[PDB]
Write a protein that binds this ligand. Sequence first.
Ligand SMILES: NC(=O)c1ccc[n+]([C@@H]2O[C@H](COP(=O)([O-])OP(=O)(O)OC[C@H]3O[C@@H](n4cnc5c(N)ncnc54)[C@H](OP(=O)(O)O)[C@@H]3O)[C@@H](O)[C@H]2O)c1
Ligand SMILES: CN(Cc1cnc2nc(N)nc(N)c2n1)c1ccc(C(=O)N[C@@H](CCC(=O)O)C(=O)O)cc1
Length: 159
Amino acid sequence: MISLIAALAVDRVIGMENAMPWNLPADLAWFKRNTLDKPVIMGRHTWESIGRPLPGRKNIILSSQPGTDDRVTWVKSVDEAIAACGDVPEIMVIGGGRVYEQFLPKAQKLYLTHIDAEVEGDTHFPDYEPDDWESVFSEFHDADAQNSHSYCFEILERR
Ligand SMILES: NC(=O)c1ccc[n+]([C@@H]2O[C@H](COP(=O)([O-])OP(=O)(O)OC[C@H]3O[C@@H](n4cnc5c(N)ncnc54)[C@H](OP(=O)(O)O)[C@@H]3O)[C@@H](O)[C@H]2O)c1
Ligand SMILES: CN(Cc1cnc2nc(N)nc(N)c2n1)c1ccc(C(=O)N[C@@H](CCC(=O)O)C(=O)O)cc1
């Protein structure tokens, strides 16, 4: 299966500039926890913000254009991308916007990080529909020294 993995602020806001309007060392952690050892599909921009391969996982990129790091596998098609994975039990789609939009419909599970902050952003998340999904997990955490805001993880299976 396919899976989306994202961290949303308020209003489904996923980011500003080619950035994230927050800093949650904890999400990153949960993120890595959920991806380690799985192929991660991403988009030219998300990749540009990462800036280096992600250890422990097969980094697949989506660029209409030419690969520019020999360390990571590039693609020019959703189908390619998906091919580029192989015989794996779960493929992680890590964003950004356009990419989400695109894979949402093929996904069957979501790992969300609901951030409790109201910030202006230029990229929102695909509108999923409640009826379809069954929340199978929640976990809460209050803000702290390091994670300046509160958040709540969640995992939903497509009903
Ligand atoms: N908040 C989170 O949970 C989370 C997770 C990931 C990313 N993000 C964020 O999301 C915002 C940026 O996302 P975005 O939507 O602007 O960019 P993106 O999805 O990361 O990058 C899009 C690029 O994908 C390439 N592309 C997409 N689909 C393609 C296809 N089918 N075939 C070929 N190329 C394809 C195009 O590249 P070219 O034309 O240049 O090749 C396109 O410009 C950020 O601020 C970032 O931090 C957030
Ligand atoms: C900009 N970006 C995209 C990003 C960030 N947080 C997200 N958070 C969630 N839940 N989902 C995403 N798709 C997501 N994507 C990043 C940036 C850094 C790292 C990163 O460093 N990952 C290390 C984590 C520890 C660290 O940053 O030192 C890893 O080993 O997985 C990952 C994604």
